[PDB]
Amino acid sequence: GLPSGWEERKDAKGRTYYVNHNNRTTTWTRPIM
Amino acid sequence: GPPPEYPFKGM
């Protein structure tokens, strides 16, 4: 699925976003690699 | 608007 250290989650409106546990950031953008 | 913030307690 996702590259190492990354987690897929959902916000309060059900919208998918991504959690970067390597650098402690979040983004709407799915990581490519 | 932005996504939820990183969960800082999880650090």
Author numbering:
A (entry chain A): 386 to 418
B (entry chain B): 237 to 247
Text of the article:
To obtain structures, we screened a series of different high- and moderate-affinity AMOT PPxY–NEDD4L WW complexes for crystallization. Two such complexes, AMOT PPxY2–NEDD4L WW1 and AMOT PPxY2–NEDD4L WW2, yielded high-resolution crystal structures (1.52 Å and 1.74 Å, respectively). All five of our new structures exhibit canonical WW domains, with three-stranded β-sheets and canonical positioning of the two eponymous Trp residues. In all three WW–PPxY complexes, the PPxY core elements bind in an extended polyproline II helical conformation across the concave WW sheet. Each conserved residue in the PPxY motif makes canonical binding interactions: the first Pro/Leu residue binds in the “XP-groove,” where it stacks against the second conserved WW Trp residue (Trp525 in WW3). The second PPxY Pro packs against a Tyr/Phe residue from the second β-strand (β2), and its carbonyl oxygen forms a hydrogen bond to the hydroxyl of a conserved Thr (in β3). The fourth Tyr residue of PPxY binds in the characteristic “Y-pocket”, forming a hydrogen bond with conserved His (in loop-II between β2 and β3). In contrast, the PPxY2–WW1 and PPxY2–WW2 complexes make few favorable contacts outside the core. On the N-terminal side, the PPxY1 backbone approaches WW3 loop-I more closely (∼6 Å) than PPxY2 in the WW1 or WW2 complexes (11 Å and 14 Å, respectively).
Several sets of host cell machinery facilitate this process, including proteins of the endosomal sorting complexes required for transport pathway, which mediates the membrane fission reaction required to complete viral budding, as well as angiomotin (AMOT) and NEDD4L, which bind one another and promote virion membrane envelopment. AMOT and NEDD4L interact through the four NEDD4L WW domains and three different AMOT Pro-Pro-x (any amino acid)-Tyr (PPxY) motifs, but these interactions are not yet well defined. Here, we report that individual AMOT PPxY and NEDD4L WW domains interact with the following general affinity hierarchies: AMOT PPxY1>PPxY2>PPxY3 and NEDD4L WW3>WW2>WW1∼WW4. Comparative structural, binding, and virological analyses reveal that complementary ionic and hydrophobic contacts on both sides of the WW–PPxY core interaction account for the unusually high affinity of the AMOT PPxY1–NEDD4L WW3 interaction.
